[PDB]
Design a protein around this ligand. Structure first.
Ligand SMILES: [Mg+2]
Ligand SMILES: [Mg+2]
Ligand SMILES: [Mg+2]
Ligand SMILES: [Mg+2]
Ligand SMILES: [Mg+2]
Ligand SMILES: [Mg+2]
Ligand SMILES: [Mg+2]
Ligand SMILES: [Mg+2]
Ligand SMILES: [Mg+2]
Ligand SMILES: [Mg+2]
Ligand SMILES: [Mg+2]
Ligand SMILES: [Mg+2]
Ligand SMILES: [Mg+2]
Ligand SMILES: [Mg+2]
Ligand SMILES: [Mg+2]
Ligand SMILES: [Mg+2]
Ligand SMILES: [Mg+2]
Ligand SMILES: [Mg+2]
Ligand SMILES: [Mg+2]
Ligand SMILES: [Mg+2]
Ligand SMILES: [Mg+2]
Ligand SMILES: [Mg+2]
Ligand SMILES: [Mg+2]
Ligand SMILES: [Mg+2]
Ligand SMILES: [Mg+2]
Ligand SMILES: [Mg+2]
Ligand SMILES: [Mg+2]
Ligand SMILES: [Mg+2]
Ligand SMILES: [Mg+2]
Ligand SMILES: [Mg+2]
Ligand SMILES: [Mg+2]
Ligand SMILES: [Mg+2]
Ligand SMILES: [Mg+2]
Ligand SMILES: [Mg+2]
Ligand SMILES: [Mg+2]
Ligand SMILES: [Mg+2]
Ligand SMILES: [Mg+2]
Ligand SMILES: [Mg+2]
Ligand SMILES: [Mg+2]
Ligand SMILES: [Mg+2]
Ligand SMILES: [Mg+2]
Ligand SMILES: [Mg+2]
Ligand SMILES: [Mg+2]
Ligand SMILES: [Mg+2]
Ligand SMILES: [Mg+2]
Ligand SMILES: [Mg+2]
Ligand SMILES: [Mg+2]
Ligand SMILES: [Mg+2]
Ligand SMILES: [Mg+2]
Ligand SMILES: [Mg+2]
Ligand SMILES: [Mg+2]
Ligand SMILES: [Mg+2]
Ligand SMILES: [Mg+2]
Ligand SMILES: [Mg+2]
Ligand SMILES: [Mg+2]
Ligand SMILES: [Mg+2]
Ligand SMILES: [Mg+2]
Ligand SMILES: [Mg+2]
Ligand SMILES: [Mg+2]
Ligand SMILES: [Mg+2]
Ligand SMILES: [Mg+2]
Ligand SMILES: [Mg+2]
Ligand SMILES: [Mg+2]
Ligand SMILES: [Mg+2]
Ligand SMILES: [Mg+2]
Ligand SMILES: [Mg+2]
Ligand SMILES: [Mg+2]
Ligand SMILES: [Mg+2]
Ligand SMILES: [Mg+2]
Ligand SMILES: [Mg+2]
Ligand SMILES: [Mg+2]
Ligand SMILES: [Mg+2]
Ligand SMILES: [Mg+2]
Ligand SMILES: [Mg+2]
Ligand SMILES: [Mg+2]
Ligand SMILES: [Mg+2]
Ligand SMILES: [Mg+2]
Ligand SMILES: [Mg+2]
Ligand SMILES: [Mg+2]
Ligand SMILES: [Mg+2]
Ligand SMILES: [Mg+2]
Ligand SMILES: [Mg+2]
Ligand SMILES: [Mg+2]
Ligand SMILES: [Mg+2]
Lengths: 56, 119, 114, 123, 209
RNA sequence: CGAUGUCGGCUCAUCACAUCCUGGGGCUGAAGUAGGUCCCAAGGGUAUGGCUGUUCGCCAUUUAAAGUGGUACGCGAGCUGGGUUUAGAACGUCGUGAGACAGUUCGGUCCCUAUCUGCCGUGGGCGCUGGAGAACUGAGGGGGGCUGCUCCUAGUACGAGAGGACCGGAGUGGACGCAUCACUGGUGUUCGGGUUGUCAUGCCAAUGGCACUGCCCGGUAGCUAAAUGCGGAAGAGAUAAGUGCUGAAAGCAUCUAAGCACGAAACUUGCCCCGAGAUGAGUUCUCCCUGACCCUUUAAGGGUCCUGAAGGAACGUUGAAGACGACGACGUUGAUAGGCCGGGUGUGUAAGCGCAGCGAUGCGUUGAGCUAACCGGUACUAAUGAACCGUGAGGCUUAACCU
RNA sequence: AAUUCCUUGUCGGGUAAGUUCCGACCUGCACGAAUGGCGUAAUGAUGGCCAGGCUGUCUCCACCCGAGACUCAGUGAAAU
RNA sequence: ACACAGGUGGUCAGGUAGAGAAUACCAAGGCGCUUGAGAGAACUCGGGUGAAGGAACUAGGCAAAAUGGUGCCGUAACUUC
RNA sequence: AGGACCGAACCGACUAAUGUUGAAAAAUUAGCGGAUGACUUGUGGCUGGGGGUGAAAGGCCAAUCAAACCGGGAGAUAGCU
């Protein structure tokens, strides 16, 4: 239920090989307000696909 | 496995799920737009949009059904007196989902849900 | 779908007399033995009806010789030859499974007259 | 759908009233027995003076099951009593001569043509 | 001999005259369209490559649509390839009807099965439950023991364990063809072919004579 | 002996063959039926219960058979704790006694979240010498391999009868496996009804909350087996044991030494699936790309600007796909999902009102109302203009052409 | 026999089948009378056995409801 | 040892059903037990249902299931009555 | 009337599952026993280590008991590791 050796720190790098994060690829620039937001998400000012959708 | 199934479990038992959407749908209509998580928002559509479907026919029976779905007289009023004639010519699709990014405290995907003709 | 239903509609027997649960009914089925298509009768109480169009079926219960015999006919099958309602009845529940233990006096159902 | 330790009922004037299945025949590891099948049974209870007796070990043929038989149309003929007809261990043919209650069309053969002849009702 | 590509419509039953209820499986087979003929001289083996169905014209890729335009045929939802037997040849743009099966008596149907997810050993390899009572601690459905003490001191290749079940290619052999409704492009086969409704099927004639 | 923690059972096995069944033979004091023994043969198959802790044993009743062993008398970081094996207690026995008895009996705590190997799955990365998208070949690898019974041959061969075949064929079962949900059913805490208590909606009515889903009765989809389809082959080749032909050595004989034939569930095929990370990295088809420059220790080089393709991925709607990833469908040109409409199914005649009835209730309106996952429709909502990645013709050496 | 080594004693009952049980037998290895003998109604979270009833204990498992497992965010151990 | 499913003496005693301080729903009153969000695989825990059979399981009916109230009727061997 | 019956609180602790680096250095859950008595409990008090106490099991005597804990002789001794 437990190791018999100390696993080398070279293994620990190899175990963390897939643990890298992932940057957000595309940021939709809003065509009206000009501010950048997540594609298919609303802006930080209540715009979505040009038009104002929610007065925050 | 869950082949061809429907509904969500939402990490809640069934009496809590039904009681939560009852409290939520009434809280929607009282404000016409609320902020909630995305899987709760995608599931609320399968409650409120039949209530608005029921809102298109002001019988005394549908008064008694919609009160049995919500248990709130004010919501029963606002459905038939206002939302009835408001959405009176829409073939479904009475609400809209707008995603406002993620929640601060627990990284939950929040989304606004609103009615279509709120503006 | 539109193809399956197109194949069921060309094998449904249109001449099925409609009925309800609790209807005392008599059914003539073909029985082949040797080269003899005799037409055996069978008569009892409809206790359950399963409706699916072509695959629709119903269950008939009788008390033969002190024994309860349930028999479930596929409705549109060509082995059934005639279905004839003898006595309609006024039951309320859609499937009469409580007639698997009521016998004699309690097995009676009152006649629908509407 | 008869397996071992199954109480059955007796369907003739052989003399028993209550038997119990102890072996399904016709193949190794054979779990279940429907109609038209030969099983070995004991006799739990008989009339005070019958052709058989409490404790006899002999064959039987199953005529009525609760799970019922099926037919090439998809129909199904259930019953209420898992009932059987006793047989000789050697000539493999019935003992009593007055079959009680109905039987089915699957029972008929050159093997059991006598039983359907004595039966009041062949479904 | 060559086969045909079909889609599983669903299961129903066909009564005969004699009251026999045959549970058939409705496979539609549309006009299979040959795309390419392989042979010895260029490819080492005689086989055809067929397609079926139709597809959105603004979906098919320029590599893929270029392959259909080489054949000069309408783009289908996928390609399949069938090994020719000898003395059995076709042109490129030749279509194929379901009337190929008009004289066969048994067929063989290959489809991707349903996928039961990540299945335990009880469901997958048909193990036995252990004793569900009499003191069973935490082990009501486990596979029990998997090996031996030390002398083959490992676990063998192909030991039946848990895991993926289904969602894979299978073939049910010698199914009985019932009716070739060539006019509305149907095929009626006795018994249940694999896979969900609407999945793709590969239907060949009987391999065992 | 700074712990290799144990009998039997269970669950999974796996191997051997000294073969239990099935297959093939030889001989028989083998008529036939049956055996008997020996040889080949491990492919698959190889009970259920009663007894007792059992191993073992005995018995019942089947089966074609109820093989023998190995694997720490296979398997406790998988279960069990009956046996043995602690502390309690008691009997018999022994001992003056404490106590002791491979004597008995009642009672008696079984830990561990997996690092590596192993394995079952499923990905990421990179390679495959321009890139991309599909389709394959099959180097290999796995799986599969059981058998009864009836009838025909035929009461034939046989046999004094009793009895009773070979061979060949047909049919039908058992067991097992794969698939599937049309049938039969199960489940169906999301659909529907009934009903108890109680509380609440002002009250009545109607609902609703809670009481294991309050308790029930049914039940759609899906999932399922007990439900029902399919499978095990045939054949080929080469053989084992064995049977031979020809045939010398050795004027003969001889199955072998040359040659030749046959010969089994075994072998290799044939069947199924995986299968080019088969690094030897395969094949086919389609598609895409035809910029300028500087720089040096000229290279399959360094940098700059230009250019960004095919396509890909992200995102989003999603799935009979799924732990996650993956896979698949779809993103307005759009039925992808939800809603909606229609159907269908199930429940079984709502509410309200009228009537009857002292009333409970009944009747009418009414196969009503409600109706989850289904079906067929519908852009009503949500699937964004995009952006991002991937580029600029693909080293060298010979060879064959071609000019 | 809570005691019998042989011993699964024998016989009877019970079961299709009983190393258990119950009843006889006495061959008491090695019972036996206040380290009590033999009975004994009642009583017992007592021991053994049988029957009925009931049932996923089982053939033979299926499905569902939750809580975990699992993914994401925050925190963040342990023996070895 | 902890903002720990434990322990801790006394006093108070609402309504309906109910014998009841049982238990259920409630009152006064007090909370929602200090990571969540999704997903809806194996497997485990805690539960619900079951065709046909009904102890065949197993050391052993362990556990589950089942029984259950009141009133009336009726009630065996045996017995220290 | 009762070391009476049933059964809550209370007091227990037979079976079973869980938990076994726990929620917990013995608990939860579901069933179980006693429940007017040899009952149960609160406050205080006494009994001291070969002693106490014990409806007796070598039990219990501050999570420790075929001889408590703490200091001392004491750096006991160790033919052993
Ligand atoms: Mg070490
Ligand atoms: Mg990681
Ligand atoms: Mg869906
Ligand atoms: Mg799937
Ligand atoms: Mg088992
Ligand atoms: Mg444990
Ligand atoms: Mg358990
Ligand atoms: Mg081990
Ligand atoms: Mg090794
Ligand atoms: Mg040692
Ligand atoms: Mg060591
Ligand atoms: Mg070890
Ligand atoms: Mg050998
Ligand atoms: Mg021989
Ligand atoms: Mg001789
Ligand atoms: Mg072999
Ligand atoms: Mg072979
Ligand atoms: Mg074998
Ligand atoms: Mg046995
Ligand atoms: Mg062995
Ligand atoms: Mg061993
Ligand atoms: Mg052990
Ligand atoms: Mg023990
Ligand atoms: Mg002691
Ligand atoms: Mg002792
Ligand atoms: Mg003495
Ligand atoms: Mg000893
Ligand atoms: Mg990879
Ligand atoms: Mg194989
Ligand atoms: Mg089904
Ligand atoms: Mg269906
Ligand atoms: Mg059903
Ligand atoms: Mg169903
Ligand atoms: Mg109520
Ligand atoms: Mg009222
Ligand atoms: Mg409340
Ligand atoms: Mg509840
Ligand atoms: Mg139901
Ligand atoms: Mg062959
Ligand atoms: Mg040969
Ligand atoms: Mg030879
Ligand atoms: Mg010769
Ligand atoms: Mg010669
Ligand atoms: Mg064979
Ligand atoms: Mg459209
Ligand atoms: Mg829609
Ligand atoms: Mg509709
Ligand atoms: Mg309906
Ligand atoms: Mg009404
Ligand atoms: Mg109602
Ligand atoms: Mg009417
Ligand atoms: Mg539609
Ligand atoms: Mg003895
Ligand atoms: Mg006896
Ligand atoms: Mg003695
Ligand atoms: Mg004396
Ligand atoms: Mg004395
Ligand atoms: Mg004595
Ligand atoms: Mg005494
Ligand atoms: Mg759960
Ligand atoms: Mg807290
Ligand atoms: Mg506390
Ligand atoms: Mg109070
Ligand atoms: Mg907390
Ligand atoms: Mg969560
Ligand atoms: Mg159940
Ligand atoms: Mg149900
Ligand atoms: Mg059941
Ligand atoms: Mg039943
Ligand atoms: Mg028994
Ligand atoms: Mg057993
Ligand atoms: Mg037993
Ligand atoms: Mg036992
Ligand atoms: Mg119990
Ligand atoms: Mg219970
Ligand atoms: Mg008392
Ligand atoms: Mg308890
Ligand atoms: Mg009491
Ligand atoms: Mg002191
Ligand atoms: Mg202590
Ligand atoms: Mg002392
Ligand atoms: Mg001392
Ligand atoms: Mg000291
Ligand atoms: Mg010292």
């Amino acid at each position: 239920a437990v190791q018999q050796n100390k696993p080398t720190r070279s293994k620990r790098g190899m175990r963390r090989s897939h643990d890298a994060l992932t940057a957000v690829t595309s940021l939709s620039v809003d065509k009206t307000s000009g501010e950048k937001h997540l594609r298919h998400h609303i802006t930080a000012d209540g715009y979505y696909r040009g038009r104002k959708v929610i007065a925050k | 496995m869950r082949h061809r199934k429907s509904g969500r479990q939402l990490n809640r038992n069934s009496s809590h799920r039904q009681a939560m959407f009852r409290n939520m749908a009434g809280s929607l209509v009282r404000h016409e737009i609320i902020k909630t998580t995305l899987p709760k928002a995608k599931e609320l559509r399968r409650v409120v949009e039949p209530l608005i479907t029921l809102a298109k026919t002001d019988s005394v029976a549908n008064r008694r059904l919609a009160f049995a779905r919500t248990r709130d007289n004010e919501i029963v009023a606002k459905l038939f007196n206002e939302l009835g004639p408001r959405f009176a010519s829409r073939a479904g699709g009475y609400t809209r989902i707008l995603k406002c990014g993620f929640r601060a405290g627990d990284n939950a995907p929040m989304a606004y849900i609103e009615l279509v003709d709120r503006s | 779908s539109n193809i399956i239903k197109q194949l069921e509609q060309e094998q449904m027997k249109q001449d099925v007399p409609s009925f309800r649960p609790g209807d005392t009914v008599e059914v003539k089925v073909w029985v082949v033995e040797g080269s003899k298509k005799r037409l055996q009768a069978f008569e009892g109480v409809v206790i359950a009806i399963r409706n699916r169009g072509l695959h629709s079926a119903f269950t008939v219960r009788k008390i033969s010789n002190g024994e309860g015999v349930e028999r479930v006919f596929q409705t549109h099958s060509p082995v059934v030859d005639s279905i004839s309602v003898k006595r309609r009845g006024a039951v309320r529940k859609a499937k009469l499974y409580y007639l698997r233990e009521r016998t004699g006096k309690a097995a009676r159902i009152k006649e629908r007259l509407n | 759908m008869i397996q071992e330790q199954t109480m059955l009922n007796v369907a003739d004037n052989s003399g028993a009233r209550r038997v119990m299945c102890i072996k399904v025949l016709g193949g190794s590891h054979r779990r279940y027995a429907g109609v038209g099948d030969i099983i070995k049974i004991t006799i739990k209870e008989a009339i005070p003076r019958g052709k058989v007796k409490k404790g006899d070990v002999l064959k039987a043929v199953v005529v009525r099951t609760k799970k019922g038989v099926r037919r090439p149309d998809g129909s199904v003929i259930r019953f209420d009593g898992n009932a059987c007809v006793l047989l000789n261990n050697n000539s493999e043919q019935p003992i009593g001569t007055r079959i009680f209650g109905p039987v089915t069309r699957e029972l008929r053969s050159e093997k059991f043509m006598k039983i359907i002849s004595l039966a009041p009702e062949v479904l | 001999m060559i086969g045909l590509v079909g889609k599983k419509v669903g299961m129903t039953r066909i009564f005969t005259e004699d009251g026999v209820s045959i549970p058939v499986t409705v496979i539609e087979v549309e006009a299979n369209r040959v795309t390419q003929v392989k042979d010895l001289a260029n490819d080492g083996y005689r086989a055809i490559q067929v397609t079926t169905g139709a597809k959105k014209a603004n979906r098919v890729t320029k590599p893929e649509a270029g392959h259909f335009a080489k054949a000069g045929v309408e783009a289908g939802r996928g390609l399949w390839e069938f090994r020719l037997a000898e003395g059995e040849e076709f042109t490129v743009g030749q279509s194929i009807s379901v009337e190929l099966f008009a004289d066969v008596k048994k067929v063989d149907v290959t489809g991707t099965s349903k996928g039961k997810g990540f299945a335990g050993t009880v469901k997958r390899w048909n193990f036995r439950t252990q004793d569900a009572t009499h003191g069973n601690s935490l082990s009501h459905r486990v596979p029990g023991s998997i090996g031996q003490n030390q002398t083959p001191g490992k676990v063998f290749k192909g030991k039946k364990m848990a895991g993926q079940m289904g969602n894979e290619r299978v073939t049910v052999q010698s199914l009985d063809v019932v009716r070739v409704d060539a006019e509305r492009n149907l095929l009626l086969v006795k018994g249940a072919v694999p896979g969900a409704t609407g999945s793709d099927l590969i239907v060949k004639p009987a391999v065992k004579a």
